[PDB]
Design a protein around this ligand. Structure first.
Ligand SMILES: *Cc1c(COP(=O)(O)O)cnc(C)c1O
Ligand SMILES: *Cc1c(COP(=O)(O)O)cnc(C)c1O
Ligand SMILES: O=C(O)CCc1c[nH]c2ccccc12
Lengths: 396, 396
């Protein structure tokens, strides 16, 4: 039965880490996968998290299945982070959140939900986009179309190009937006552009789907929610796929959420029932650990204060490595002018290196960047900055 | 977009838990969902688990994404528990295991894998079977057919009916077997019926799929693996969906595995790349906690020794409630003879109560039993025995 199975191609991202892990070279650098690293080059557990884990260790008395939609309080806190103190969505009981296994799991969930309960046929994703996006949608039998987004020549958001691209998108079509920290570009619309887009999708009849995996890494918790929030003010309906993988360093515990928003409660409940159904036929209930850690942290004023500060510490550190990257490049005599690098937010940067230069960097210098030339800034450190910056310069 | 969504029908199992919750009646008894309770009526964390958890608390230095297939040690450990210490399967590098989010997610992973990569068009599940089976397979766009299995009249496995209905299973059709502790019947084939079944499927060209969710609750670890192990001895190809939910009390942490078996390494590797592909488009990578907990325990001789004893205590305890159940019934009225109840394995007994009798137990007496008339013996305790058995005599 398996005699003819074809080996699957490799994950452009995931499969890189393997390549990395397997290289016996000494001073290898990893600018591939988006993982936050510290000054010392390690991927640490936040202390707020260790604090929460102790608490759970001490207080948990059962491992009883969670509800299909997960830990209630986790949900509540998620909606508050997403939408705000007074948001109507909340007061109007217009949003239902399901805790899922990662931001990834929430995308699949929304996908299966849409493919089975709606007349959605295609999903519009930006170009470029996070490669996993097409696979997840394709798996649910949905069609993935792309909309222009990035001005490579200028290193910015090509608004009209974007706008002109979407016009081709029909009403009842799903339009996928990155909450903040566009992966892989690092360019996010301005509050006005977001406003625009908002009004626009209202009129075109688009279902907005937000992929929000970096809340807190661009400007801040509350500011990075501005575009969502602008959409949330005009829309009856929307879907939100958030992740706690990055802002809490909980990568492997698979923590994320799927938020559904209908015009009203009677509606959101019905729909949600369909979403829970989709979950039931998938993994059933979500893993409690990571989510319990998150609810604890956001529930508690002390822990929360501590976590928020570690988050602000991670962000500021990336902001710092960015300035450091540009200057060191420059100080090493790079051809090009890399200052656009500073106007980018989040962990990455679209470095503008060719497929061949990234290949070269790897084989030759042991530097691992994604073929898109996407470099993980959060993987840079004052110690590797020099060697990193030289290989780049040697390939330019 | 969500205007016309119809609400779904609640989980025939999960649904009840909700009702249960919502029920204010002081002395409610919950014989629905399969959760192991203790003398005191609580659903506890295993000691070996708390121990492994502290260990992680103190030793983990990163939350770094796991591989798509999860913890290697976990895989190794599961294979050994499945096939046995020195299996050929293991020496010939013929089995690849993926850590999954519960036995559930492992079923969905095998499903999606099958649907997308093999031309399997239908799945044969026993009747009666675990309700969630249909939904998983169906979601993968797979056809669920049923094969005869239980002799309602004499409370047993109807071998002929079994055999006779499988004839209509074409070659290359997937045949789903319960490794042990048949859910919901409690009747499992004898090594000989397994042997025979084995032979048959070879001869008929079926792909065997094992749902192994109760390893260790019937007789013991090794003893419950004799059916599988027999099949692994004749098969070239196999799939195993196993859960650590019940035997480790790790319900909410989502711990299970999906083991693929092929004629050889090359084959298994190729195939498995396809399985990993299906995972990627799903939840990406699995939740570490639970599995880490499982690997820690099974790799450490001491913790392992403590765990096997807790497992053995759980099993023994169920066996006790079993004989006490029948005895109490008798000793309290009961027109029927419930002795068949003692030859049944695992957590539940197929009580032979009707849909209306169960409705009544609930409504009237506050006892929760599935509509199939399936009762969780593990939820029975010396303290609730009496009342339970009395409200049982009241509906006969
Ligand atoms: C990381 C990421 C996700 C989800 O990641 P998880 O680990 O599954 O939470 C989703 N979208 C983008 C753009 C991401 O970078
Ligand atoms: C409980 C159960 C499973 C797996 O449950 P998980 O909690 O997802 O591991 C699989 N099969 C049967 C028959 C079960 O009863
Ligand atoms: O009753 C069972 O089969 C085990 C408990 C149970 C009810 N619904 C479930 C769905 C997934 C996993 C386990 C369960």
């Amino acid at each position: 039965m398996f005699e003819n199975i074809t080996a699957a191609p490799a994950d452009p991202i995931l499969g890189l880490a393997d390549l990395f892990r397997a290289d016996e070279r000494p001073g290898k650098i990893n600018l591939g996968i988006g993982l936050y690293y510290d000054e010392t080059g390690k991927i640490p557990v936040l202390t707020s998290v260790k604090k929460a884990e102790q608490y759970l260790l001490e207080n948990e008395t059962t491992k009883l299945y969670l509800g299909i939609d997960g830990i209630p309080e986790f949900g509540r806190c998620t909606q508050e982070l997403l939408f705000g103190k007074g948001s109507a969505l909340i007061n109007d009981k217009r949003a239902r959140t399901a805790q899922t296994p990662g931001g990834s799991g929430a995308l699949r969930v929304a996908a299966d939900f849409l493919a089975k309960n709606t007349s959605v046929k295609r999903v519009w994703v930006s170009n470029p986009s996070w490669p996993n996006h097409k696979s997840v949608f394709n798996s649910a039998g949905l069609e993935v179309r792309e909309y222009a987004y990035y001005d490579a020549e200028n290193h910015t958001l090509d608004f009209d190009a974007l706008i002109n691209s979407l016009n081709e998108a029909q009403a009842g079509d799903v339009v996928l937006f990155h909450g903040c920290c566009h992966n892989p570009t690092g360019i996010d619309p301005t509050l006005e552009q977001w406003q625009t887009l908002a009004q626009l999708s209202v009129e075109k009849g688009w279902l907005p789907l937000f992929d929000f995996a970096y809340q807190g890494f661009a400007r801040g918790l509350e500011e990075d929610a501005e575009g969502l929030r602008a959409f949330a003010a005009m829309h009856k309906e929307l879907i939100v796929a958030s992740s706690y993988s990055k802002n809490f360093g909980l990568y492997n515990e698979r923590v994320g959420a799927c938020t559904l928003v209908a015009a009203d409660s009677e509606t959101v409940d019905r729909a949600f029932s369909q979403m829970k159904a989709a979950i039931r036929a998938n993994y059933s209930s979500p893993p409690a650990h990571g989510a319990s850690v998150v609810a604890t942290i956001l529930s508690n004023d002390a822990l929360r204060a501590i976590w928020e500060q570690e988050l602000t510490d991670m962000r500021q550190r990336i902001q710092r490595m960015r300035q450091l990257f540009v200057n060191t490049l420059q100080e090493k005599g790079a051809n090009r002018d890399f200052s656009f690098i500073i106007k980018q937010n989040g962990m990455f940067s679209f470095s503008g290196l060719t497929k061949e230069q990234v290949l070269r960097l790897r084989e030759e210098f042991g530097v691992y960047a994604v073929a898109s030339g996407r470099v993980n800034v959060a993987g840079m450190t004052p110690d590797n900055m020099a060697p990193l910056c030289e290989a780049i310069v040697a390939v330019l």
